RNA sequence: CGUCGCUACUACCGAUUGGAUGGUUUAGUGAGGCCCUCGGAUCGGCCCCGCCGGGGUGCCCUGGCGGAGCGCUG
RNA sequence: CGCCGGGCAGCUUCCGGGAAACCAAAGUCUUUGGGUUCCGGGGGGAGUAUGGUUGCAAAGCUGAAACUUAAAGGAAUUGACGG
RNA sequence: UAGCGUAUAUUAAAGUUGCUGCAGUUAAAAAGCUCGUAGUUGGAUCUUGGGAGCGGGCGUCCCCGCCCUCUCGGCGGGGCCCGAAGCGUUUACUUUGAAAAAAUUAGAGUGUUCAAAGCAGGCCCGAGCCGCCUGGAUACCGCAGCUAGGAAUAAUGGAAUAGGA
RNA sequence: UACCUGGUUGAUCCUGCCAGUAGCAUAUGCUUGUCUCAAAGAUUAAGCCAUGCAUGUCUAAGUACGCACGGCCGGUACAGUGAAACUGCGAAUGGCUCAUUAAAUCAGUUAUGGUUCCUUUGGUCGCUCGCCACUUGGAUAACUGUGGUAAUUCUAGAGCUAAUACAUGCCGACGGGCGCUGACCCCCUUCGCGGGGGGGAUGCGUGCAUUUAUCAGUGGUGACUCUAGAUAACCUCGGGCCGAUCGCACGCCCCCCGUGGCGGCGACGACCCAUUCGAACGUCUGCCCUAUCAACUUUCGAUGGUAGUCGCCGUGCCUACCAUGGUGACCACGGGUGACGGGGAAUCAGGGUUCGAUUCCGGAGAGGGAGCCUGAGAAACGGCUACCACAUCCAAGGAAGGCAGCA
RNA sequence: AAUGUAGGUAAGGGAAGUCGGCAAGCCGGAUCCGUAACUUCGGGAUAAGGAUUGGCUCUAAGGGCUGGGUCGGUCGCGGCC
């Protein structure tokens, strides 16, 4: 859809949209150039972020949010919240006295970037930890990988 | 008093938490500034750390900028239009950091005939010849002349910025924060962002 | 608290300090300065537990007050002033300066230097900005920092402050090959080469380091501080040439030594 | 082995719309502080200027009483 | 008359186990670990009181405490006794 | 034995809470029976053997050498070398290293007159020693987090409408 | 030291508990010669407190006209010692206690590229073109005198007097340079036009800090919307900096001359940067018992989005508009705790089971709540304000309280 | 005027009046919350209890009708492909 959905203005602060439309440009068309970033530690830009529409200062790739802490992984749960999902973590917690394990896990709520589109429930997130976008969210997902999927009957 | 922490707040899972301490002073809030229109009065609040911070209680004059011609004015407000939070805002002409306010176009109307030689925001002319008969001719030399003719071919403004001109008034966008620096910077609408603008106002009334 | 603590615990103290147990309450505190508390030394126990010049505070407070003790070339005052890592304290009334440097086992030894050489400093450069009217700048390891350096000058490298000026006038990159000495950790004080750096983008570089006897370490970048060009220090090292050797081959020299007294 | 009768002790049910003491709260009232909008008991400056005064020479350099300009101000 | 597989069992055995009765499983357990479910912690009070829940009812499921007690029990042996 | 009794909480005894490590026919105990979701547990199978001198002595023992790729090899054009990029999965596991307050615990040294302690102390002094030698170690620190070797065991995936290399 | 013994029976093998046995940790009983260490109103009542003390502070280097002493060397602003008081700093540390508190505190790990920071140390302090500066104004302490109240560390009136308190405010650098605006002139293709450049009189802004918007891409990160440049402007009268400060010995220049210009060592001070002590909110993992607590949260924020407000900053912290989310048998939610958490302690084959009010670290509280001034830092209580419960004096009009500090 | 019939008000107390709260009085609509014992599980229930309610000036939300053409390559300033 458009992406003016707001009762305010979307823009990207960094990008000046006015750039004094004269004879010398031809109009149209002139192409909004886009405001993108690397985030480091390997992670690549995705290309829909780098040729999107979406805005979101969430983002990490065209948002005003920086990666830094830890990077780790989990499954995607559900996705019924706004420009944000929910996943899952495993783990086993050790018990010494039983020299055993338990399997205990914990739900994490974790921003989604519009770049992110062909994310369905137990794909594989990697988030990396950022600044507190809500009460409850301070990861942004970096990486998607599929669950033995890549293909639709 | 008006308390910022997070421990009043119910947990994730839904349930009631309890509180290990009494609200401490750092975790405070202070009343808000609402910034009204019209002549200046700012208080001087002290913060954390015996820095300063500037209540706007009124302002009725704020640094705007064009943006597309680089120029920056010290205008005056005259009412807010629109605001993206809350209409009562607009009603009670109250200055926020994201509002939109109409602001005085006289500054840059003037830079305008004093930087391309066009007339702006005028209707027929001869109407104020002990000045702007100066500025229309200048007598200028060739070199100078050369230099203003070379500069009119980019003299072209967007037909909104025109009729806003011709009005008398543009509408622009604060970007300080009144209440927490004390005054009302912003920037002059145009574009993508006017027309979107234009078209909330319009859908609101009219 | 409501407040910042003024007072350290006897027992809370650092380690390395060397304090016992059976003095007192409390420890010297020190005041703030050129390096953090818990890798200071400060001149109150220097002077009373290190080198047994004053036998109380109020004597090394006399000893201070009469204007003797030069920490850097400037004469200090504070009874608690954090000396730190190699700045040369100097007594001109009985003519002999100190280089605080760790010994083998990561205590401030009190190593004593000639004149000549403690005219000079090593630090290790900390952070490098640039600031207003474009003029870049120099924070080493202490808070000294000074203006327009040598561009070359890159990050944890080395410098050489002569004092009485505070001027650069020579320094060591970090570069493979070049001695080091360890400034933190379990690794604290030992002499060696950097033999290699392996880096962790979002996290602490690691570098692995290869005494004289050929035993080799690692340490955290933070805990490096260059003392040499390739293998010669610009120093002069203390006694055991921060080799730290274990408790097998330190017995049987503690064995020699007694039957060469005896 | 159980009922029944006597004596102790321990709990249970029980009308009494029982009682007491804590805790958390709805609603009403609401001290006090803080913020905002007023407010103006007083305290100062300029305009002093009924005047003597006045010096580069009625045209004051002002050394003070004095009304108060019945305003502008902080 | 045999052979094979899955069953109901039976006889026998110093496989072995078990307190023993006995059990080819109740064996392969101090030479202790194939996977997994339920469940007991001296005898009474008591499967009682109360709360919850199911039922038309009778009742079912879940289920205490105070207090009391030095034994209560299992298998076998000898004797005594047996309408 | 200058200490000893009593009451109470708690630990061992208690393999009478049983992970190690208890029981459940008759002693207390396996649901009337079956299905069944969470939970827990899941069959076999993918590199083994062949090599050279150092070699737990080819001494047919074997410290042990093993007989990934591509990019400026920093000693636009040398073989005189070793750095920049990635891992032909992701993990669990195991070993190493770092970072992990002190005191306490274990433990090194030290005749506190012995010890509990403490972190001290020791060498000569012929009297001029216009002073010498030291110590104030080390170990452990679960789980979680970080790093580098190994790849047996266990989970997890790659090419099947080829939408494959 | 990887341990057992008595008790059910007429007797025997068991199951099984009772009892015995040893340690430590509280109390108590009896006894007690020496010496070295050493806990000690935690358990009940975080119950109530008389009295006394527990936080004050001056160097040569802010302000001395107190006679309160005193050198005078005697014609002099101030010798000096200094009470009192103003100013500055501290009083937010320490000490006590463990009531609250169950992903809360706390431990390890990591981040603040999402913040503030007194002091110390190091940078910066002629970068700004703009009729007192050989030094500006007023008030107030202390002090004298007049008092009021029963009372208090209560204070009023009147009269003086200072600043590193409170204000005001220059010169110097300072010659100019830079960026716009450009009077006009000159060299110019020359040619009848256009010309390509040089100068330039008159004007407007120039530095750092702040708040916007725009352009380009000296150093640095793993990654800035970083830092540093450039342009346009702002720069808040309860309004940023651009020193009206104080000691120590005293010396140099004299052409102009003859009274001026210079000088060293400090101290105090600062806008900002860095550092140090930190602090604050976050990331991951970890906590006892309970289902006779199975469904919670969400009008009154519960989960998320957008835009703001507020806060030192990131964030439903709060507001407005939207979406209907978020957590649970991997135990949510609720309840209990005779729960402050941890380092640790007792016991000791191995595994464990109990205890950690208690000297170290972190947290919380000062009778119960709540709200604030000051300050860098407090929701402070040996600070204030109000209510509640206690409770002191009173001449009944008022006034003063907080030992879970040491006794 | 009394006495009555019908309708009101009454300080302080609040059923002490009376066989007996007879009579009168209280409450009352709507909106938002919030509702017990017991129960034949349908109810009790408008349980009980609490808050709000005027005027004026605004702000949001809840709908219906038509028309959206890229054009003279042309003549039925208009029409067929
Ligand atoms: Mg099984
Ligand atoms: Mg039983
Ligand atoms: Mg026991
Ligand atoms: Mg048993
Ligand atoms: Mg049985
Ligand atoms: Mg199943
Ligand atoms: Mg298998
Ligand atoms: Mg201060
Ligand atoms: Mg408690
Ligand atoms: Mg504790
Ligand atoms: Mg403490
Ligand atoms: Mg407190
Ligand atoms: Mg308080
Ligand atoms: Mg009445
Ligand atoms: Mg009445
Ligand atoms: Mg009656
Ligand atoms: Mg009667
Ligand atoms: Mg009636
Ligand atoms: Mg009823
Ligand atoms: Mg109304």
Redesign the interface.
Known sequence: ADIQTERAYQKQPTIFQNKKRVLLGETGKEKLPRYYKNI???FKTPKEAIEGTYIDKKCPFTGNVSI?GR?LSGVVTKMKMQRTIVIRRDYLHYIRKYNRFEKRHKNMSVHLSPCFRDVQIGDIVTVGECRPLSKTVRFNVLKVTKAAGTKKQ | GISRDNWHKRRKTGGKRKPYHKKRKYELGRPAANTKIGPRRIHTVRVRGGNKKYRALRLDVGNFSWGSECCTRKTRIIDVVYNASNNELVRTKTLVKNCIVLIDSTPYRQWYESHYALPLGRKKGAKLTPEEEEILNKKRSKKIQKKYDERKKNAKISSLLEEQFQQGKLLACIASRPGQCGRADGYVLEGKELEFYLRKIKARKG | ARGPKKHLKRVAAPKHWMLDKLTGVFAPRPSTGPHKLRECLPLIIFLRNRLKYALTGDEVKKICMQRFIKIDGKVRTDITYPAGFMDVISIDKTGENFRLIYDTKGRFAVHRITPEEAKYKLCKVRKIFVGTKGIPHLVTHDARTIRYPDPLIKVNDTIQIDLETGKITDFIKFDTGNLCMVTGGANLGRIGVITNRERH??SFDVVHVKDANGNSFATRLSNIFVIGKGNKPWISLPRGKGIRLTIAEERDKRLAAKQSSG
């Open positions: 480091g530690l390997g830094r990077i | 983008p979002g």
